Amino acid sequence: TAHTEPSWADLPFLDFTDPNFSWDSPEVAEAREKSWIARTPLALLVLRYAEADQLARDKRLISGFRGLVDMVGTPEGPVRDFMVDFLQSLDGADHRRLRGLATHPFTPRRITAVQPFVRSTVEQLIDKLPQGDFDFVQHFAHPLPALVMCQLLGFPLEDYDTVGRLSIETNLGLALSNDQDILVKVEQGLGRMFDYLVAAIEKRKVEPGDDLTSDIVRAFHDGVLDDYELRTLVATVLVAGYETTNHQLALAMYDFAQHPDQWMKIKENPELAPQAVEEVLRWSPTLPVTATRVAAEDFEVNGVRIPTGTPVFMCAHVAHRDPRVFADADRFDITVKREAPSIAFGGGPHFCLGTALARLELTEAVAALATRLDPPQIAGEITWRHELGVAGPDALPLRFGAA
Ligand code: HEM
């Protein structure tokens, strides 16, 4: 009988954990043309838009995070605890219960309500921008999502830098490991983050506000979740809301620095902003791989059998360059009215909780920056994030206008 899965015989191979690998290489394009799904050593990789969108919702595929933790063999400890218990690792009743307590402030209706704050914050950040060369992350891409999360979670607004610094230094992008050197840094960062969070939580336990930390504390007083679930959930929302938005904002500037004519088009027509943001999400999603799933049962799709326990990764970046769906897919173009959205936010039960908030922050940022400033220009060497997950500039030296 068969030595390998018969339906896997023709699947193109890709190794995204290879120093020379690029999502935009011709070999990746060839793979997507040959097959809707590629084989990697440890996981199947979905490359075409239709299947990536559909399978992220497929109930036969649950969260693969716990599978990955066992795959990398993280030892028993605080880092493993967080990685196996946090929202993205859960499914069924536990997931819907915990996600449910964090949903309210992120619903489209409630995002409308925070819009005035976002616009005012963007305006203020632009008012005090430096006038020569400067780090865009330091002066805009970091402050904006840090302040927004502080506002939503009930943290003092002057704590925005500390909160941002705390999120970065958890090094959660490096947590999928069994190396002790890395795991020391991750644990130390998580501990310091929990120090701030527990202090905020204990304060809301006695004097609650209308913020999300206060909301979750009330659920804790109603016995819906325990103390550990409480702090883990707050930590989850904070980290997931900060780094992604930060890097995506920095990628937006990078995209327009490479294509400044399109910046002038938004200045000419501010109405282009939402479409422009969606193009940034299509062209350069901060999470090239969005949904990390695992087969919960044996099933078949397009004649390819996916047995129980198969890790399945949704490759948003490659799916965004699918010419079956997007016209002139490998060209950055904000002017094209597109039928299909980006799938930068994944899908299914785990679909990004702050999707509407993310689009708001990006749209408000882009619209105001383009209306008030000249096109961005790269002003020095960029420091890129070299990790699995969040991608984009950690530091972006630039100037708005040649003079
Ligand atoms: C401040 C705004 C944001 C907030 C509050 C937020 C929050 C969250 C949370 C709590 C989760 C876990 C959901 C779950 O497991 O049930 C999540 C997942 C996710 N987020 Fe975000 N996020 C934000 C911005 C972004 C941005 C800018 C991107 C990239 C474009 C992004 C991409 C994703 C993806 C791809 C997932 C996984 C979805 C899946 O597995 O199907 N998020 N987010």
3-state SS string over 123-173? HHHHHCCCCCCEEHHHHHHCHHHHHHHHHHHCCCHHHHHHHHHHHHCCCHH
* Determination approach: X-ray
Residue of the nearest CA to atom 21 in ligand 1? 352
Q: Which fold has domain 1-403?
A: Cytochrome p450 (1.10.630)
392 lines ligand 1 (CB under 6 A): no
**Distance between CA atoms of residues 244 and 354, nearest Å:** 10
**Distance between CA atoms of residues 131 and 134, nearest Å:** 8
Which residues make beta-bridge pairs with 123? none
362 lines ligand 1 (CB under 6 A): no
Q: What are the domain boundaries of the chain?
A: 1-403
Residue of the nearest CA to atom 31 in ligand 1? 345
19: its two tokens: 């120093």
**Phi, psi (deg, nearest 5) at residue 4:** -130, 160
What Å resolution does this PDB entry report?
2.1
**Distance between CA atoms of residues 363 and 241, nearest Å:** 16
Which residues make beta-bridge pairs with 126? none
| The three-state (H, E, C) secondary structure of 66-92, written as one string | HHHHHHHCCCCCHHHHHHHHCHHHCCH
289 lines ligand 1 (CB under 6 A): no
